[PDB]
Amino acid sequence: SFLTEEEQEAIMKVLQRDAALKRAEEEDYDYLIKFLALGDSGVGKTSVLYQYTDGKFNSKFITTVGIDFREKRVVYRASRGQRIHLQLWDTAGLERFRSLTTAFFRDAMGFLLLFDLTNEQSFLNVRNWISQLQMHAYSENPDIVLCGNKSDLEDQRVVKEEEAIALAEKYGIPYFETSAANGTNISQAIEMLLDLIMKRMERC
Amino acid sequence: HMSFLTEEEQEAIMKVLQRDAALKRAEEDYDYLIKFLALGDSGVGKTSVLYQYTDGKFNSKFITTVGIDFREKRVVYRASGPDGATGRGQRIHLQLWDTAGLERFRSLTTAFFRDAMGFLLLFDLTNEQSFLNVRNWISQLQMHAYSENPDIVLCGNKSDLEDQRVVKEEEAIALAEKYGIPYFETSAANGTNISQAIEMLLDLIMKRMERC
Numbered sequence: 001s002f003l004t005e006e007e008q009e010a011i012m013k014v015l016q017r018d019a020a021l022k023r024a025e026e027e028d029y030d031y032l033i034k035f036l037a038l039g040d041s042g043v044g045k046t047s048v049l050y051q052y053t054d055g056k057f058n059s060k061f062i063t064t065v066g067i068d069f070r071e072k073r074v075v076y077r078a079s080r081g082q083r084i085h086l087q088l089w090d091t092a093g094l095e096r097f098r099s100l101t102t103a104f105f106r107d108a109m110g111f112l113l114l115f116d117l118t119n120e121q122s123f124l125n126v127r128n129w130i131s132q133l134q135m136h137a138y139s140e141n142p143d144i145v146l147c148g149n150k151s152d153l154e155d156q157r158v159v160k161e162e163e164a165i166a167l168a169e170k171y172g173i174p175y176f177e178t179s180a181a182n183g184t185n186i187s188q189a190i191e192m193l194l195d196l197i198m199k200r201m202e203r204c
Numbered sequence: 205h206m207s208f209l210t211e212e213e214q215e216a217i218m219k220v221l222q223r224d225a226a227l228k229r230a231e232e233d234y235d236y237l238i239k240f241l242a243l244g245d246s247g248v249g250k251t252s253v254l255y256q257y258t259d260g261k262f263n264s265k266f267i268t269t270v271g272i273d274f275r276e277k278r279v280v281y282r283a284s285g286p287d288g289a290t291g292r293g294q295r296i297h298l299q300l301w302d303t304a305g306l307e308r309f310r311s312l313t314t315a316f317f318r319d320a321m322g323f324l325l326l327f328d329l330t331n332e333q334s335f336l337n338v339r340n341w342i343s344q345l346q347m348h349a350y351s352e353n354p355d356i357v358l359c360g361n362k363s364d365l366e367d368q369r370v371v372k373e374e375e376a377i378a379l380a381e382k383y384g385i386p387y388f389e390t391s392a393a394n395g396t397n398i399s400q401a402i403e404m405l406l407d408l409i410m411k412r413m414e415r416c
């Protein structure tokens with residue numbers, strides 16, 4: 001396989017869309033907040049963001065061409081309501097896109113790190129992903145929310161919940177078991193990441 | 205049939221990104237981190253121009269850039285105000301991004317247009333097609349930069365190869381006048397106008413930064 005021009009054109013459209021958005025915020029809403037989802041190919045990053053923004057799910061696998069993003073206007077409340085414009089970056093997991101996607105780790109204010117509860121290797125790769133984030137994000141200690149996705153496939157689960165909770169506590173990061181197919185914990189995990197980011201932004 | 209990045213190519217790019225992240229964390233000594241980006245067709249001399257500027261050296265051998273790289277330079281900038289009244293020396297850390305011109309790297313390099321505060325747009329005085337593509341590069345910058353009117357300095361490079369020049373001076377000055385951007389004929393081999401073009405771009409960006 002070769003880099004096609006359709007693949008390259010699609011990526012250029014995303015970057016054009018990103019430039020337009022970033023120029024409009026230069027300048028309605030009160031804050032542009034940027035997240036990035038990452039993890040092995042096929043763990044469900046694109047599905048998770050789609051379920052969150054649109055409440056929909058497609059079982060067919062359409063691997064992401066390098067990079068994409070979705071948007072959602074939401075209201076955040078610390079524990080008054082602030083209007084938040086979320087840019088939700090969606091990275092491709094395949095190694096062939098690794099250097100293009102790493103280039104966008106530095107644009108994110110926090111990270112949604114996914115593995116697949118039905119694929120043990122994706123869970124073992126979590127610590128490497130965290131290493132790459134520590135090496136490439138805006139800070140060596142960025143906010144991360146870990147998601148074990150595909151919780152609706154209980155008869156195919158291989159990652160024991162205890163093993164996942166243990167890993168997440170060792171690193172100090174919140175953990176959620178999610179399903180992009182039925183929406184379980186999706187908004188809870190993302191709202192947790194947003195709160196972690198709003199608090200760290202307030203104390204700046 | 206554009207080839208995908210090999211694993212050697214990808215490792216080289218990842219090292220650059222690692223180096224950039226280290227640099228970006230250090231800023232949280234100097235007074236300002238300023239970022240430029242050089243772009244243009246493959247083989248016009250972007251890498252050579254930046255190497256001549258930071259190190260004063262030149263290599264005849266063509267080593268095409270593996271996607272993206274950058275060089276660094278600490279310089280002292282002094283504003284120019286009324287009647288040549290020059291201000292205090294400000295310490296500037298320049299990050300000079302160097303993009304590959306080959307199409308197979310276009311989407312990787314375009315991703316970095318948004319990180320630059322200004323652009324060094326090069327063509328090759330001995331290659332008319334490199335000059336004819338300048339208008340497309342500028343359209344690509346207007347579409348992808350932080351502003352639809354970012355600061356650009358146009359460099360016609362390889363001015364030392366006078367017997368191979370094919371770009372007439374008139375057409376390039378006319379193009380730069382039409383777009384409102386400074387134009388320099390440069391040579392990375394002997395240094396002519398290299399520092400003038402980069403200092404002009406730096407001055408443009410410091411002025412635009414002042415008025416914020």
Ligand SMILES: Nc1nc2c(ncn2[C@@H]2O[C@H](COP(=O)(O)OP(=O)(O)NP(=O)(O)O)[C@@H](O)[C@H]2O)c(=O)[nH]1
Pocket residue numbers: 039040041042043044045046047048058059060061062063064065091092093094149150151152153178179180181182
């Ligand atoms: N049952 C179930 N299937 C899911 C879930 N999340 C994703 N999938 C399925 O798993 C496959 C991969 O999903 P996708 O979101 O494209 O994964 P990705 O992480 O974006 N892959 P890539 O990095 O290659 O773009 C798809 O067939 C999708 O339907 C989930 O929670 N439950």
Ligand SMILES: Nc1nc2c(ncn2[C@@H]2O[C@H](COP(=O)(O)OP(=O)(O)NP(=O)(O)O)[C@@H](O)[C@H]2O)c(=O)[nH]1
Pocket residue numbers: 244245246247248249250251252253263264265266267268269270303304305306361362363364365390391392393394
């Ligand atoms: N005589 C002369 N040769 C030059 C000059 N600038 C570059 N060259 C030569 O032209 C070739 C290409 O230069 P290089 O800086 O690698 O070009 P580039 O724009 O970075 N190419 P790429 O986009 O593929 O990385 C090299 O052989 C280099 O020595 C110049 O001002 N004069």
Ligand SMILES: *CCC(=O)N1CCC[C@H]1c1ccc(OC)cc1
Pocket residue numbers: 106107108109110138197198200201203204
């Ligand atoms: C207050 C400055 C800061 O570092 N923040 C705000 C919330 C998280 C963090 C941040 C991370 C990454 C970016 O990249 C745009 C901006 C802000």
Ligand SMILES: *CCC(=O)N1CCC[C@H]1c1ccc(OC)cc1
Pocket residue numbers: 318319320321350409410412413414415416
């Ligand atoms: C005055 C504010 C501004 O837009 N500036 C300062 C100098 C150039 C310009 C700028 C462009 C792009 C970036 O991206 C990092 C920063 C600053």
Ligand SMILES: [Mg+2]
Pocket residue numbers: 045046047062063064090091092093
């Ligand atoms: Mg995807």
Ligand SMILES: [Mg+2]
Pocket residue numbers: 250251252267268269302303304
């Ligand atoms: Mg080069």
